[PDB]
């Protein structure tokens, strides 16, 4: 369908390339969540700050070492780091206005989480050009079976490893090229409505190729509930008011 394809091209203007150069250098994907606030994965912030830094200083380091481009066209973020979560692997940052127009926010209400079918992901695999990809949902009930099949096929040449996606309705699973460094990329359902944020996969190297057993992202519903419970005053000023 092309009306959805034209919609996803429009939405892709809200998907950003996050770059950092701190003690290390790297990139990730992010997207405008609500207003000036962007979303990315929590493990990305951990890579920016690195290990052994007091929490009082993360906001200053983030403000000093992060830049975001949605295309001199870039945004800094505010030295502010308060809404985030390790298990759901999300982090909110706030863009600093600089006269350039902020792209439209992508959170557009309570999209149902697709239990099967097709989803779309927008982001920057390999830290290169922005891409829009279509992926098939892997239903929850087939996750454990899919993982063992593919591990055994390779060994032909356990499930304690995968037991963070097995009974987790808070994630969608799928197979995507966005495994290659596009963590933080927003995930859309077949209508082009924001449903999730791509998180990670299960990396391994086989015949000198880096591959992944399965990929997953945390649902917007689970992220928003966490924000609603843990940061109710912030939720009401940003989402309600």
Residue numbers in the entry: 343 to 413, 422 to 507, 516 to 599
Reported in the publication:
FAM111A (FAM111 trypsin-like peptidase A) is a serine protease involved in multiple cellular processes including antiviral defense and DNA replication. FAM111A contains a serine protease domain (SPD) with a conserved catalytic triad (His385, Asp439, and Ser541). The FAM111A SPD belongs to the S1 family of serine peptidases, which includes chymotrypsin, in the MEROPS database. Here, we show that FAM111A is a dimerization-dependent protease containing a narrow, recessed active site that cleaves substrates with a chymotrypsin-like specificity.
Therefore, to generate a mutant SPD that would crystalize without forming the α1 dimer interface even at the very high concentrations used for crystallization, we truncated the N-terminal SPD to remove two-thirds of the dimer interface and included an engineered V347D mutation to create a construct that we have named mini-SPD. The mini-SPD crystallized with two polypeptide chains present in the asymmetric unit. Although helix α1 is still present and visible in the electron density map, the dimerization interface observed in the full SPD dimer structure is noticeably absent. Overall, the mini-SPD and SPD dimer structures possess a significant degree of similarity with an overall RMSD value of 0.5 Å, but with some small yet impactful differences. The catalytic triad Asp-His-Ser (in this construct the catalytic Ser541 was retained as wildtype) is unchanged, which is expected as they are anchored on the rigid beta-barrel domain. In contrast, several disordered regions were noted in the mini-SPD where some of the residues comprising the dimerization interface, several surface-exposed loops, and the oxyanion hole are altered. Residues 413-422 that form a part of the loop L4 between β4 and β5 were disordered and not observed in the mini-SPD. Another region adjoining the β6-β7 loop (Loop L6, residues 474-480) is also disordered in one chain and altered compared to the dimeric SPD in the other chain. The differences observed between the two chains of the mini-SPD structure and the dimeric SPD as well as the higher B-factors observed for residues 536–538 encompassing the oxyanion hole and S1 pocket indicate that the monomeric SPD is more disordered. This suggests that dimerization of the SPD is associated with a disorder-to-order transition that supports the oxyanion hole residues in the conformation that is competent for catalysis.
